[PDB]
């Protein structure tokens, strides 16, 4: 018995009133469950038996449904209404939950601000070079970072990362990192990083030469 | 009425998992309780149940390695989980599974804060940190960015600050990113005034518990001057 949530992402400004619906494989009558999952804290329980709003918490949270179909709306969007929902069925075991969906705010698209950080000297002395390129308060989240070494495209020497929107200018930020030996690094001289997002009508690239 | 989880935080592999539930405000006895994992990328996971009845109601697809118990002398109940792969790495939550004697099954209604438990062989070790100096090449307008790599650590996690806690303004502590070497790495920046730059002294403070590392880098800029 599976549960299937929809949207699996959904963006909204603070104060719509947005709806997340659940759908089950089978009949299951009422029992269902909502959560909120805010990273850092622990879960909480908004509604159960579908409908029946959880004590404590803000009647601008409410549940229908029966059967197959459940729907979990929320009026008025606050601050802290943006974060992961699961509903999950009770009917037997196993219980499931659904796949959740991520709510996040929506605003104007911005292009990131890209720096770039060669190694550091003290880093250089072990013998492993870390480029670091950081792509700073940007939005929509989406963004891809190709480096470049001497022109030549990387591939599989990089790892990234990108912080949770932000609370305050709903912005995302990305921190990616080239990976390459001391040699190998003393060898080229230009580290370009190429960056993807729709806020750039095209690809820019910030690069430096190696010791200028 | 609380709940507090407690157990390794990284547990190698094919080796036996033991994680266990503090309670608080309430006798273990008179409640069913629950524990449910979250494998980072994936969603939830009903584990099992533990009941007074010591009935059996596990998930089958672990079924085969899991065990749930109850200490009343201890008021706890724990979750016992041989084998353990990279597959069982996640965040494991125990709750109060709520249910009403006509009525039936309710929800999952007191939940713990959770702990992440990483299956890894790699040994503790103590993060490297290497500054992101500002330069030419990381400044736009009146701001420049800076701040520290912390390389080669595990496992999580690390803290940053930076000035003791004194600048939090723009500052950005990305999450971590796991290297075939096995070991962490993650970065956290700021971007502050250009000016200020000669003047204000900038120091990250990097902060792993796990190998009681405890380093503060400062962060001087890097220019032709």
């Known amino acids: 018995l599976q549960m299937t949530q929809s949207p699996s992402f959904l963006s909204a400004s603070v104060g719509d009133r947005v709806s997340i619906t659940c759908r089950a494989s089978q009949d299951i009558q009422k029992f269902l469950a909502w959560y909120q999952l805010t990273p850092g804290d622990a ?3 908004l509604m159960y038996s579908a409908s029946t709003l959880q004590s404590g918490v803000p009647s601008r949270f409410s549940g229908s449904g029966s059967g197959t179909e459940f729907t979990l709306t929320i009026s008025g969007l606050q601050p802290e209404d943006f974060a992961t929902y699961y509903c999950q069925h009770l009917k037997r075991y196993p219980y499931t939950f659904g796949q959740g969906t991520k709510l996040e705010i929506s605003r104007t698209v911005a292009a990131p601000s890209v720096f770039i950080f060669p190694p550091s000297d003290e880093q250089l002395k072990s013998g492993t070079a870390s480029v670091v390129c950081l792509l700073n308060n940007f939005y929509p989240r989406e963004a891809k970072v190709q ?8 591939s599989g020497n990089s790892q990234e990362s990108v912080t949770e929107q932000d609370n305050k200018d709903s912005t995302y930020s990305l921190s990616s990192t080239l990976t390459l030996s001391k040699a190998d690094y003393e060898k080229h001289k230009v580290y370009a990083c190429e960056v993807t997002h729709q806020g750039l009508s095209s690809p820019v690239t910030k690069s430096f030469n190696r010791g200028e | 009425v609380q709940l507090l989880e407690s157990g390794p935080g990284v547990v190698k592999p094919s080796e036996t998992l033991s994680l266990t539930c503090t309670v608080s405000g309430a006798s273990v006895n008179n409640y069913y309780w629950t524990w449910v994992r979250q494998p980072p990328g994936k969603g939830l996971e009903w584990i099992g149940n ?3 009845s010591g009935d059996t109601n596990y998930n089958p697809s672990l079924s085969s390695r899991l065990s749930l118990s109850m200490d009343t ?4 109940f724990s979750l016992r989980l041989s084998s353990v792969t990279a597959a069982d790495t996640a965040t494991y939550y125990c709750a109060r599974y709520h249910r009403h004697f006509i009525r039936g099954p309710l929800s999952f209604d007191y939940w713990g804060r959770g702990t992440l438990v990483t299956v890894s062989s790699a ?6 940190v290497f500054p992101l100096a500002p330069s030419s090449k990381s400044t736009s307008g009146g701001t420049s960015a800076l701040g520290c790599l912390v390389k080669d650590y595990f496992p ?3 803290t ?3 000035n003791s806690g004194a600048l939090t303004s723009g500052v950005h502590t990305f999450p971590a990113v ?5 070991l962490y790495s993650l970065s956290s920046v700021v971007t502050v005034p250009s000016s200020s730059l000669g003047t204000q002294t900038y120091i990250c403070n990097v902060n792993h518990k796990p190998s009681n590392t405890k380093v503060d880098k400062k962060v001087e800029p890097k220019s032709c001057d």
């Open chain 1, 147 to 154: 480096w470049k070494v001497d022109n030549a495209l990387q």
């Open chain 2, 123 to 128: 040994s503790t070790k103590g993060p490297s």
């Open chain 2, 50 to 52: 533990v009941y007074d």
């Open chain 2, 73 to 76: 002398s201890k008021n706890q």
């Open chain 2, 178 to 182: 796991l290297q075939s070497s096995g």
């Open chain 2, 160 to 162: 940053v600050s930076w």
């Open chain 2, 156 to 158: 999580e996690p690390v």
């Open chain 1, 43 to 45: 879960p909480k329980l």
